[PDB]
Amino acid sequence: ITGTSTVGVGRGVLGDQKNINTTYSTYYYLQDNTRGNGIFTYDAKYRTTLPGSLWADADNQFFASYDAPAVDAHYYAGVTYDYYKNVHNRLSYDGNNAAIRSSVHYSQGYNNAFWNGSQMVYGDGDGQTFIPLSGGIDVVAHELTHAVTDYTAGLIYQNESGAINEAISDIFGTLVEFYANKNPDWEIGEDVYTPGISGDSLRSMSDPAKYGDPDHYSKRYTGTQDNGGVHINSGIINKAAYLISQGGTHYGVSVVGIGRDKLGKIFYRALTQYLTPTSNFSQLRAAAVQSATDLYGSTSQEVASVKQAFDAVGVK
Numbered sequence: 001i002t003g004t005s006t007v008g009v010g011r012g013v014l015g016d017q018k019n020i021n022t023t024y025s026t027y028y029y030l031q032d033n034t035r036g037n038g039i040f041t042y043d044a045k046y047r048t049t050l051p052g053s054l055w056a057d058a059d060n061q062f063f064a065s066y067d068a069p070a071v072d073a074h075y076y077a078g079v080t081y082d083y084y085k086n087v088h089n090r091l092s093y094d095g096n097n098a099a100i101r102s103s104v105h106y107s108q109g110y111n112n113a114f115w116n117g118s119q120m121v122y123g124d125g126d127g128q129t130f131i132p133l134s135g136g137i138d139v140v141a142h143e144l145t146h147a148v149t150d151y152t153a154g155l156i157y158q159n160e161s162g163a164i165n166e167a168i169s170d171i172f173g174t175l176v177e178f179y180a181n182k183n184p185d186w187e188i189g190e191d192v193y194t195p196g197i198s199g200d201s202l203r204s205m206s207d208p209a210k211y212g213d214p215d216h217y218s219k220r221y222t223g224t225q226d227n228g229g230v231h232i233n234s235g236i237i238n239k240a241a242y243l244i245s246q247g248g249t250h251y252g253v254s255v256v257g258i259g260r261d262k263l264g265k266i267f268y269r270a271l272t273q274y275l276t277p278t279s280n281f282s283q284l285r286a287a288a289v290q291s292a293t294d295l296y297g298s299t300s301q302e303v304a305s306v307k308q309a310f311d312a313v314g315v316k
């Protein structure tokens, strides 16, 4: 909507107070005009018709419980945007400052969020397995990273190419969580997952096995469930990334860490220069290996670490 760019205030899912860029025209709409062509947040009103209604607020103050999911979705979408702009020199998910649209209050007790090819969609959770999922910055960045992939590598969402796609969203969802630096870890969804269980998460990049996911190519799931286990075998590529950045010894193979920032530059370049829709794990290794060579040279520690990490997880 047309209006004047102003700044509101509100509290998020986790009870933290934060400012949000809004637009005034009778009401105060969740419309962030300070970022690309806009970050718009909508209200699905507990239904599944998308996007819904561009969030309208009468006083620019968003402290009601019903406003919280919209606050985090509106706020954390801008954080992810900033991450891709400041770090990777990418303007929104399509590189041309595409508008970022998110719908909250999706359906009733919906325990999931997703990118539907055009927007992000957050459920409020059933209060037991999940609380509103926009509360997790890694969740928000995870889903917006799916948009970045759709516009770049375009990895099919099935089998190895899908696991890579999921792994990319887990990686850059974690790196955004660090980029914001508010209780950052190598776990996925800890901030919105099971409020009545202290210390657990949905997935674990550090130890995928913690929750039953493979951390080595031998233990990969080969059935049909989960589009071939895209949320399962992502652990193999999650672990590899966790080793590239943090380093360690995994099944006896030792990996020297190079840090998060370099992991990011490597995987982004792979995602935007060398990966294709049908890429597989072995092709992902090659993509990361070339990226690290372009960035730091063939005889560099970075290249060695990549080879060491994909070796540790059994990817040749």
Ligand SMILES: N[C@@H](CCCC[NH3+])C(=O)O
Residues within 6 Å of the ligand: 111, 112, 113, 202, 231
């Ligand atoms: N995001 C993952 C896990 C969500 C938790 C189960 N609903 C998936 O959709 O597979």
Ligand SMILES: O[C@@H]1[C@@H](O)[C@H](O)OC[C@H]1O
Residues within 6 Å of the ligand: 064, 066, 067
């Ligand atoms: O209580 C909710 C209120 O916060 C919102 O503004 O409109 C819908 C209501 O259900």
Ligand SMILES: O[C@@H]1[C@@H](O)[C@H](O)OC[C@H]1O
Residues within 6 Å of the ligand: 046, 107, 108, 109
């Ligand atoms: O507020 C209620 C909401 O919690 C539920 O999801 O759907 C019914 C609503 O009235």
Ligand SMILES: O[C@@H]1[C@@H](O)[C@H](O)OC[C@H]1O
Residues within 6 Å of the ligand: 209, 210, 211, 212, 213
């Ligand atoms: O997935 C497994 C989990 O269920 C168990 O509790 O601890 C070991 C894991 O491999």
Ligand SMILES: [Ca+2]
Residues within 6 Å of the ligand: 057, 058, 059, 060, 061, 062, 063
């Ligand atoms: Ca208000």
Ligand SMILES: [Ca+2]
Residues within 6 Å of the ligand: 177, 182, 183, 184, 185, 190, 191
């Ligand atoms: Ca965290």
Ligand SMILES: [Ca+2]
Residues within 6 Å of the ligand: 138, 174, 177, 184, 185, 186, 187, 188, 189, 190
């Ligand atoms: Ca996390």
Ligand SMILES: [Ca+2]
Residues within 6 Å of the ligand: 190, 193, 194, 195, 196, 197, 198, 199, 200, 201
């Ligand atoms: Ca928990």
Ligand SMILES: [Zn+2]
Residues within 6 Å of the ligand: 142, 143, 146, 166, 169
């Ligand atoms: Zn995903």
